[PDB]
């Protein structure tokens, strides 16, 4: 009643065509097949798919066999695992190489892997890496197969990553930290370190000590996109696993060794088009990078802290002192003409989280790094006692909040996204630079709308539309982003809105 038509093949023989009763034990089928070819000891054999990854057939997966499938009679997984336990440890180096090749093939099959793992097969591989001689020089091909088999076995999730010795860890890290070796070995070594880091806080700690920022970044400079992808993956893994209180230091260390420009020049603008898995790693890197802003975003100012109040005083001084009766008039209004809602105690405005102290950081950056722009914006609006001034303090806080929303500061990385904004790979302080560009935009839009204070939320909405219609054009640089914004003036936003209506 429940039948599947298959052909079963064996080297040197003609196929047997069977109508397999799915109620019959596989052992009965295999004995039939063996008898057909005069093979003794049917219990030594099993069936596997002839095509694809050639998986072993079990009483489970036999249900998936489609009519007309070609199967092969093969050595059973248990006997194959025992044979490879012997041969991967042969003193005959050709025997060992051949065995490791076969082990790398079979280890992807969980039916085989469980047999091999249950004889401490993984320890055969780790002991070889720990103590084998001339592995990189004389036996690099064998070593690549060894590492392939190791990673395939570990990927079945049967045993904990914490089983690995400090000696094995150090050897794998050694392959990464060395003036680059074989590409196959480096690829697998990076892959193993990534998996170790992701799966164990203990392994993360040991690995973080064994590899330098410089060594990791150097691997981004190879022309091989898979090496580059695993290098960024390992970097991402270290960031993901780093304690909250160490992640910022790590970012500064990578930044000082030019991680960003190396990615820009060797990946983003590289000869080889970026394929999906590299794109995904660039997405994760950008998510982790924006999340470095999250703590400050959620930090409230302490309005009773004189040092923090003094930062706002400094901000005001930089602008107001660039302006004498006029200057006096500004200061008599406390912080009103710097545009804070809380005129007398602007520190209170920085207790809103988001954006909290991040907004203060952005303002101080603009004032220290782009003083002329800062002064222009404040002074065009600090003597304005018609209701048309653009309030700097209030605007900057709301803009910082808006940028955090747009760029999704605080969002976790997930499996489904591969998107990133390439212009953030073009400047060490791209977030702060973006703030400066967007506060100039906000002031331009404000003036284009002849806005008053009552219009504040409407202007912010236009500015939000401007920014978010510019980003999907994927500007290559901050300058390109600026050019794009110029093509989205208030009058253009009006036209686009009308076209929707």
């Amino acid at each position: 009643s429940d039948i599947v038509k298959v052909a079963i093949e064996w080297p040197g023989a003609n196929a047997q065509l069977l109508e397999i009763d799915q109620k019959r034990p596989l052992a009965s089928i295999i004995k039939e097949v063996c008898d057909g070819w005069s093979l003794p000891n049917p219990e030594y054999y099993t069936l596997r798919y002839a095509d694809g990854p050639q998986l072993y057939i079990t009483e489970q997966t036999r249900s998936d066999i489609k009519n007309g499938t070609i199967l092969q009679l093969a050595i059973s997984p248990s006997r194959a695992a025992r044979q490879l336990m012997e041969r991967t440890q042969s003193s005959n180096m050709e025997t060992r190489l051949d065995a490791m090749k076969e082990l790398a093939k079979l280890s992807a099959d969980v039916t085989f892997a469980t047999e091999f793992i249950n004889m401490d097969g993984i320890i055969v591989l780790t002991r070889l890496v720990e103590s084998g001689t001339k592995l990189l020089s004389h036996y690099s091909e064998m070593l690549a197969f060894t590492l392939t088999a190791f990673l395939e076995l570990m990927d079945h999730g049967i045993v904990s990553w914490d089983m690995v010795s400090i000696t094995f860890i150090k050897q794998i890290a050694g392959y990464v930290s060395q003036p680059m070796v074989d590409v196959s070995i480096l690829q697998r070594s990076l892959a193993i370190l990534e998996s170790m880091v992701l799966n164990s806080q203990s392994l993360y700690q040991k690995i973080a000590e064994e590899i330098t920022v410089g060594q990791l970044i150097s691997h981004l400079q190879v022309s091989n996109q898979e090496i580059q992808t695993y290098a960024i993956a390992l970097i991402n893994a270290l960031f993901l696993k780093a304690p909250e209180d160490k992640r910022q230091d790590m970012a500064n260390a990578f930044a000082q060794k030019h991680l960003r420009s190396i990615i820009l020049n060797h990946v983003i603008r590289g000869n080889r088009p970026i394929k999906t898995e590299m794109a995904h790693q660039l997405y994760v890197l950008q998510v982790l990078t924006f999340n470095l802003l999250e703590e400050r975003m959620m930090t409230k100012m302490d309005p009773n802290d004189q040092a923090q109040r003094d930062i706002i005083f400094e901000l005001r001084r930089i602008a107001f002192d660039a302006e004498t009766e006029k200057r006096k008039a500004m200061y008599t209004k406390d912080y009103k003409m710097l545009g804070f809602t809380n005129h007398i105690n602007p520190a209170m405005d920085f207790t809103q989280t988001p954006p909290g102290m991040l907004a203060l950081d952005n303002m101080l950056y603009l004032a220290k790094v782009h003083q002329d722009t800062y002064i222009r914006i404040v002074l065009e609006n600090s003597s304005r006692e018609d209701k048309h001034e653009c309030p700097f303090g209030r605007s900057a806080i709301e803009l910082t909040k808006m940028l955090c929303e747009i760029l999704q500061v605080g969002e976790l990385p997930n499996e489904g996204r591969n998107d990133y904004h390439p212009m953030f790979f073009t400047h060490d302080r791209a977030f702060e630079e973006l703030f400066g560009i967007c506060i100039q935009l906000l002031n331009k839009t404000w003036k284009e709308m002849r806005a008053t204070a009552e219009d504040f939320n409407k202007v912010m909405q236009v500015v939000r539309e401007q920014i978010t219609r510019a980003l999907p054009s994927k500007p290559n640089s901050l300058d390109q982003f600026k050019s794009k914004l110029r093509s989205l003036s208030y009058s253009e936003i009006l036209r686009l809105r009308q076209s929707e209506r």
């Binding site: 790398a104 992807a108 392939t148 990673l151 395939e152 990927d155 690829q187 697998r188 892959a191 990534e194 998996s195 992701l198 799966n199 898979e226 992808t229 695993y230 993956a233 991402n236 893994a237 993901l240 696993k241 780093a242 304690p243 909250e244 209180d245 898995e277 995904h280 994760v284 999340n291 999250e294 976790l412 990385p413 997930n414 499996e415």
Partner: peptide
Amino acid sequence: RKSRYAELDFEKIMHTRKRHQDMFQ
């Protein structure tokens, strides 16, 4: 303080398994 990343399925988010499969053909 705890890590904001402590609770996620790191291999799944990182596509670790898929990348191995790509590498091992």
